[PDB]
Amino acid sequence: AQNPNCNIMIFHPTKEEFNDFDKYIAYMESQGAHRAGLAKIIPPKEWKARETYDNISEILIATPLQQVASGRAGVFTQYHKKKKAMTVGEYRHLANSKKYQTPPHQNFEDLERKYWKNRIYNSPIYGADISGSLFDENTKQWNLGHLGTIQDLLEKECGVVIEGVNTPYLYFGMWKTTFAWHTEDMDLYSINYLHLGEPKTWYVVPPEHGQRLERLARELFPGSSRGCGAFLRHKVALISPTVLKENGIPFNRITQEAGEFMVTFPYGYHAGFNHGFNCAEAINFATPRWIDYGKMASQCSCGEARVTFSMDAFVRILQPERYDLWKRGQD
Numbered sequence: 001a002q003n004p005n006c007n008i009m010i011f012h013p014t015k016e017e018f019n020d021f022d023k024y025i026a027y028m029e030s031q032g033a034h035r036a037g038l039a040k041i042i043p044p045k046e047w048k049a050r051e052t053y054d055n056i057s058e059i060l061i062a063t064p065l066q067q068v069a070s071g072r073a074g075v076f077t078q079y080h081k082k083k084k085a086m087t088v089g090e091y092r093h094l095a096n097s098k099k100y101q102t103p104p105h106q107n108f109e110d111l112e113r114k115y116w117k118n119r120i121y122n123s124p125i126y127g128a129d130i131s132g133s134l135f136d137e138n139t140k141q142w143n144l145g146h147l148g149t150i151q152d153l154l155e156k157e158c159g160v161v162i163e164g165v166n167t168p169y170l171y172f173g174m175w176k177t178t179f180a181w182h183t184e185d186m187d188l189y190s191i192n193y194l195h196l197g198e199p200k201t202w203y204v205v206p207p208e209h210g211q212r213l214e215r216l217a218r219e220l221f222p223g224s225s226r227g228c229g230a231f232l233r234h235k236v237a238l239i240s241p242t243v244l245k246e247n248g249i250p251f252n253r254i255t256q257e258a259g260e261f262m263v264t265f266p267y268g269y270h271a272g273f274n275h276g277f278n279c280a281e282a283i284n285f286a287t288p289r290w291i292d293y294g295k296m297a298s299q300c301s302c303g304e305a306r307v308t309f310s311m312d313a314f315v316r317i318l319q320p321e322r323y324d325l326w327k328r329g330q331d
């Protein structure tokens with residue numbers, strides 16, 4: 001078995017290897033990359049996403065989200081308070097202000113220590129889930145707006161044609177902006193490109209140990225667990241690496257820098273935070289190996305999760321028994 005310790009692997013494809021996206025994902029898995037739940041891919045030196053990022057300031061963040069924490073430093077939830085719209089130029093200025101800017105720090109480890117010590121005492125503002133893309137239309141390789149769709153994958157694998165579409169999302173972050181412990185909708189893959197700015201630190205639990213994280217989460221957020229059998233779908237719970245270690249949960253960590261791709265694999269729980277002003281682009285995708293994970297995916301039906309139009313068909317076809325109860329939670 002490849003990668004039995006479930007380490008995060010880092011790949012350096014050549015420009016030739018960077019042509020066929022599906023083939024390279026399959027290659028990474030042949031080397032055991034999926035066992036970690038997360039992989040880093042450093043693009044060929046010849047590749048670029050677009051020419052420059054000099055003209056992005058007029059992009060609108062229609063609904064910036066203030067991430068307000070409750071709990072303890074290492075075990076907390078966050079809720080999202082909607083703020084007034086602002087442009088990316090305005091957001092960047094806010095990120096760099098004295099109130100929100102990254103503090104002085106020695107290295108990534110120092111900054112990580114500061115994050116977990118102090119995160120709950122601040123409420124950073126995130127521009128999340130903004131439909132759009134910053135890939136140049138002429139970028140032919142690993143263009144996240146030109147990937148094969150999940151709907152076509154399901155059709156190729158299972159022979160059923162379904163409605164729905166699959167487009168990328170932009171994320172504008174600042175110091176301490178946080179993504180809660182989660183797997184993707186329908187336990188899909190995700191791919192994330194850090195276009196510009198300061199790093200993003202990731203934590204990940206191997207897919208084969210996901211239920212260990214779930215059990216700890218139920219213990220640490222007992223009211224939430226009573227309210228919903230899949231409350232991590234709400235994407236509001238944070239658990240620090242110190243608390244994971246104290247409870248024997250297997251996990252890994254890695255920091256993503258500008259110009260690098262991360263791939264998360266089916267049922268790989270992940271969480272993390274941004275170091276300072278940045279912009280990432282991400283999208284879900286599928287492979288033939290995903291189908292059985294999709295069938296298995298645990299669903300929120302309490303109504304909190306509330307997801308896209310396109311997930312309907314996934315639940316309808318892969319989880320017909322669950323479909324009635326789940327759809328009630330969306331409508």
Ligand SMILES: c1ccc(-c2c[nH]cn2)cc1
Pocket residue numbers: 187267292293296297298
């Ligand atoms: C195979 C077996 C179990 C799973 C699973 C368990 N819980 C969520 N997903 C996924 C794939």
Ligand SMILES: O=C(O)CNC(=O)C(=O)O
Pocket residue numbers: 171178179190191192264280282283
């Ligand atoms: O970058 C973020 O804020 C969160 N990203 C993801 O969870 C992802 O790409 O799967």
Ligand code: NI
Pocket residue numbers: 182183184190264270
């Ligand atoms: Ni994710």
Ligand SMILES: [Zn+2]
Pocket residue numbers: 227228229230231233234300301302303304305
């Ligand atoms: Zn729920």
